[PDB]
Amino acid sequence: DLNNAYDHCKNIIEKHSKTFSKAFAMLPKHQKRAVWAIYAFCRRADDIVDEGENPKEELEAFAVEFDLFMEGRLETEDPCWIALQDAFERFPLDPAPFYEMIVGQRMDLYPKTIDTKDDLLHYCYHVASTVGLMLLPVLAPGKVSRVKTGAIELGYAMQITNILRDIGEDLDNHRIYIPKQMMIEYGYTRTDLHNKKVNEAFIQLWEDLAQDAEHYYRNALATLPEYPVYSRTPVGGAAKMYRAIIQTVRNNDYQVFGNYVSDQMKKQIIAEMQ
Amino acid sequence: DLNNAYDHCKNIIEKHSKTFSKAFAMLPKHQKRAVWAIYAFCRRADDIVDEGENPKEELEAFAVEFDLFMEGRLETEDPCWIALQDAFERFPLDPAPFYEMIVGQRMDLYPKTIDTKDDLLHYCYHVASTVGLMLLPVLAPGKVSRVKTGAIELGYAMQITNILRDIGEDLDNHRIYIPKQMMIEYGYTRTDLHNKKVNEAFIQLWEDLAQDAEHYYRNALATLPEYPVYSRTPVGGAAKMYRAIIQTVRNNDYQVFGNYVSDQMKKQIIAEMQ
Ligand SMILES: CC(C)=CCC/C(C)=C/CSP(=O)(O)OP(=O)(O)O
Ligand SMILES: CC(C)=CCC/C(C)=C/CSP(=O)(O)OP(=O)(O)O
Ligand SMILES: CC(C)=CCC/C(C)=C/CSP(=O)(O)OP(=O)(O)O
Ligand SMILES: CC(C)=CCC/C(C)=C/CSP(=O)(O)OP(=O)(O)O
Ligand SMILES: [Mg+2]
Ligand SMILES: [Mg+2]
Ligand SMILES: [Mg+2]
Ligand SMILES: [Mg+2]
Ligand SMILES: [Mg+2]
Ligand SMILES: [Mg+2]
Numbered sequence: 095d096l097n098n099a100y101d102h103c104k105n106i107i108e109k110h111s112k113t114f115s116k117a118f119a120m121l122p123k124h125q126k127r128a129v130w131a132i133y134a135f136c137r138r139a140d141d142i143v144d145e146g147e148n149p150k151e152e153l154e155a156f157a158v159e160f161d162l163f164m165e166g167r168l169e170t171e172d173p174c175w176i177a178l179q180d181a182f183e184r185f186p187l188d189p190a191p192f193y194e195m196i197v198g199q200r201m202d203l204y205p206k207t208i209d210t211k212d213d214l215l216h217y218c219y220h221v222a223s224t225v226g227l228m229l230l231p232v233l234a235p236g237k238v239s240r241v242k243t244g245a246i247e248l249g250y251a252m253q254i255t256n257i258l259r260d261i262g263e264d265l266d267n268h269r270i271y272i273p274k275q276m277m278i279e280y281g282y283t284r285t286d287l288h289n290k291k292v293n294e295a296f297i298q299l300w301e302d303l304a305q306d307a308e309h310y311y312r313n314a315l316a317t318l319p320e321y322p323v324y325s326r327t328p329v330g331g332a333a334k335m336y337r338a339i340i341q342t343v344r345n346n347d348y349q350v351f352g353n354y355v356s357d358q359m360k361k362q363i364i365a366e367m368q
Numbered sequence: 369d370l371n372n373a374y375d376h377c378k379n380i381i382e383k384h385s386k387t388f389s390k391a392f393a394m395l396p397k398h399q400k401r402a403v404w405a406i407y408a409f410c411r412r413a414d415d416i417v418d419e420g421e422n423p424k425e426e427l428e429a430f431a432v433e434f435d436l437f438m439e440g441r442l443e444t445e446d447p448c449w450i451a452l453q454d455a456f457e458r459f460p461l462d463p464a465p466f467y468e469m470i471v472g473q474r475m476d477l478y479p480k481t482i483d484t485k486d487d488l489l490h491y492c493y494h495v496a497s498t499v500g501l502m503l504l505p506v507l508a509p510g511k512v513s514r515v516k517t518g519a520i521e522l523g524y525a526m527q528i529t530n531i532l533r534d535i536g537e538d539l540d541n542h543r544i545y546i547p548k549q550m551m552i553e554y555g556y557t558r559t560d561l562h563n564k565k566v567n568e569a570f571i572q573l574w575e576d577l578a579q580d581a582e583h584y585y586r587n588a589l590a591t592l593p594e595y596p597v598y599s600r601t602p603v604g605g606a607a608k609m610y611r612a613i614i615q616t617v618r619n620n621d622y623q624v625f626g627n628y629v630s631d632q633m634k635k636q637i638i639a640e641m642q
Contacts, residue, residue: 096507149559207481274479
């Protein structure tokens, strides 16, 4: 039944994201469950590309499942698809950003170099802003057009934050999301990055991206009054909690070659939102 | 004196390249010493970018030295510059490919993705074909125009060979020279490459590049009669010796994630050339 299939998706979000489970547990019942289902879609697709043994074939098999899903002919016992089917039934979810999300996951299948900041935003749009777009009909039922730009920019904001915390982790998987033009601008070589060096040039480049993330966070938060009241604390809380990763890395002297917002800090952000 | 400064450059080539020291020891005295000096220039610049701690600044300091060298005002005790200065005095060396070589070394300073085969040839031209061009006035004094295309293609041939043997070694330094379009064409993912997988798709892609190298080797060898007699065995020998790396990897079942032409095989190639 629906409660079991949603409970499965609740287990996924609570296992993989402390920040987003605590934010979204504050939504009303049916919005919260739909976000759980939307989350499990995103998290499966990202796990295929980033952690599956055969990512080209697994993701293509995942997208075919979604084509069948969207045509209402996917018949299965998989709780995530049963939860998503109700969510799509219960709220006017748009499939466009769901597809766009898969197009973004495709980008991580083969070697790519981010050259410019726009390259970076293009990537961030497809793997993170799309998720913002998937959620808006649940979060802002009648006001999607009024809040869409801020949702997109909140996407940029959090993906850059995640990239900025995961520099070493991404290097060890032979991924670089730092724009090459910035590395040239600040004199931070690939040899420097290979030697996991935190010098003044690295900090300059990190801070330049971090301030971009911060402007986007600010834009997104400026749209929070346009959300319905029940969405303001979960959306605002999730943003501030994730934004707090940046300052965490600052207080740890930018050591991103070995970072969590603390549980207590997370609660402080929530309480301030309340 | 000159004999000491050339003897220093002889020590460099014999330490770093079995293939090219044995080929070029067969040249007459003054051609052989000049090749030694030309070799030490190339090998210093490549060592800066690939093994220096501060490659942006070291290579720029190396290029400034060469600007001063070319204006005849570099005064030093460094044997490699004293050997190169005679070589430039003794033979009509062109500085154009020497500069182009540094432009090619610049490319390895920051993250880059080879997208297409032309990307690859562009890179190979600047780091390997230029070396062919540096050598031609010593190897083919009056016939540079007649043999230049083959020298360039011999460049392509050997750089691809080197890339093709060094796939794992280059991966561990966070370098990928495989064109991304080929990985897409043959279904060889970045995850596959990260898992150092030698599957049928990897072999298909490897063999496609290997046949390109082989066509270029064939073109270059077809120009060998246009070289003067004393250059035919060293140029032909060096090419066949380096080309033999490809078949070596074939006989080792393409295991390039852990390959040498044997000493005895090297001698067989030389004797056949003689
Ligand atoms: C679906 C919602 C609301 C949030 C999660 C979206 C999702 C699946 C993010 C993948 S997070 P993660 O693997 O930590 O980040 P990346 O390295 O893939 O860029
Ligand atoms: C919540 C709203 C309004 C927009 C969300 C934008 C968003 C959730 C981008 C992905 S955050 P990510 O770090 O990728 O996912 P987790 O580490 O929390 O698992
Ligand atoms: C100067 C002559 C005739 C041959 C040597 C040219 C030279 C310095 C090649 C560098 S070889 P190597 O480091 O093994 O090859 P790459 O990985 O740099 O592409
Ligand atoms: C000898 C002629 C005519 C053209 C030479 C083209 C050439 C030497 C390209 C570099 S071979 P490389 O593998 O880079 O250098 P080593 O491993 O032998 O040190
Ligand atoms: Mg991902
Ligand atoms: Mg990921
Ligand atoms: Mg990450
Ligand atoms: Mg090199
Ligand atoms: Mg090298
Ligand atoms: Mg190599």
